[PDB]
Symmetry: C2
Subunit: 245 residues, 2 copies
Amino acid sequence: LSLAAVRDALVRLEDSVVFALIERARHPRNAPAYAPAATAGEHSLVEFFVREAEALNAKAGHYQKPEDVPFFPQDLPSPLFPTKPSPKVLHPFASLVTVNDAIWKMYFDELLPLFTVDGDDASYAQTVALDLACLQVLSQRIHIGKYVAEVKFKDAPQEYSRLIKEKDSNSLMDMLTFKAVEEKVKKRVEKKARTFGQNVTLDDNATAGDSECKVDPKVLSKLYDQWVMPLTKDVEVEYLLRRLD
Amino acid sequence: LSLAAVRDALVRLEDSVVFALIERARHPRNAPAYAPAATAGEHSLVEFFVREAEALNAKAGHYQKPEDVPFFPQDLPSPLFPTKPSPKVLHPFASLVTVNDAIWKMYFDELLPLFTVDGDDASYAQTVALDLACLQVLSQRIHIGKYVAEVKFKDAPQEYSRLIKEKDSNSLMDMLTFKAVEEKVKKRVEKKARTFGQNVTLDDNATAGDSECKVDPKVLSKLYDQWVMPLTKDVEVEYLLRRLD
C-alpha cells in the first residue's frame, strides 16, 4: 500500500529479531532437541513441536496474510473461527512465493552455532519454542519482500515490466538492490543488539566493548548481510517474475 | 542452592518481561480474542489457545520444574520424550503452590489495558501467542519464589520453622521483605523498558522521551510494585506454610 508503511514494518522487525535471538541465547545448543528420529513419521523434537504449533496457529486463523507463511503448509487445518476478508493488496499468484525451506536450513545449520553456546541444559521444550519464535520473526521479515517488490514495481512499472518480460532475474536483482540502505540496516541492527543485549544497571558504569552483550552484535550484522537481506531479495525477485501473470 | 544465583535468575527475567510486553504491544487490544461469545463454546480464543499450547508444551517435556507452572494443570498430558530425573532441591509438597489463577486474572483484567492501545487489527492468532509468552515469563518469575523461600529457610531454619508452626503469615511476610531491593528492581525494570523500547536510531545526537517508548516505562514499575513482587512473595509465604509437612 505505502512505501513508508512497508519500510516501517521492516524496521520494527529489527527489534523483534534482536529480541528473539537474545532470548534463545539464554539456553545452550541443546543438540538432543534437534536429533532426528529413528523412523519416518516420527520426527525430531523441534519438528514435532513446530508441526504441532503451526496446526494450532492455523486453527486460530494464522497464515492468511502473504507475509505469514508456515514451515509445514501441507497438513494445515482450516481456521476454526470467523475470518475478516483479505485486504488483497498483492498480486495473488506472485504472493505464493516461499523461501521457508531455506530459512529453516539456515537457522539450524548456520545461525544457531553463531549465537548459542556449546552445552546442554535439560530445557529442550523451552528451547524449541524459542527456536520457533526466531524462525517466525525471520520468515515474516523475509516474506515482507513481497510487499517490498510490489511497492518497487508500482514505483517504476515500465522499467520493471521490461525485465520481467525477458525473465531477467540478474537485472531485476540489480534494480531491487539499495546497497546504501543495506549498510544502514546492518549498522542499526548492530546498534540494536548493543542496546538490548546490554546489562542494564542503575549505575551507568563503563563496559569494555561488547563483552557484556548477550548476543554478539556482529552476529546480527552477519545474519542480515548473508541471509536475511539476501533471502528477502530472493523473494522480491521471485515475486516480480510472476508480477505480470 | 545459592541465593545469589536465584537473584541472578530473577534479574535476567526482568529483560524477558520487558521484551514480552514490548512484543505483545505490537498489536492493539484485539478484544474479540478474549470475548467468550466470539467463538463457539464457553471458551474465548485466548483460553482455547493456551490450553492447546500447554498440552503441546507438556508433550515436549515442559512443566517439569517447580518454576514452570501451567495455567491449566488438570488437563496436562505426559511427556512424549524421556525426561531424565532431576535434582530435588525443593520440598515436594510445598513445591506445588501455584498462584497462576491470580496471575491470569491480573494480566487480562489489569495489565493488558495499560500497555496495549485500544483498537483492532484482525491479528488474533498472533495476539494470543504473544499473550501466552507474557503469561509464561510472569509465572516463571513469580514461582521462582519457591527457590527464594527455600534458601531463606535453610539459613535461618529455626526462627522460620517457629513462624510456620504458629501459622504467622504477616510475620513470615515481614521476614521475607527487603524493601530496599524492591526499590532497585522497580527503578531498574523501568530503566530496561526505557532502554529496550526506544526507537534506536543511527543518530548519536538524538534523544527522545518516554513518549517514543513502545511501552511506557512506568507500566513496568507499576507491574512489579503492584503484582509481580507481591505475588512472588505470596508464593514464598505459601511455600513456607507447608515447609514443615
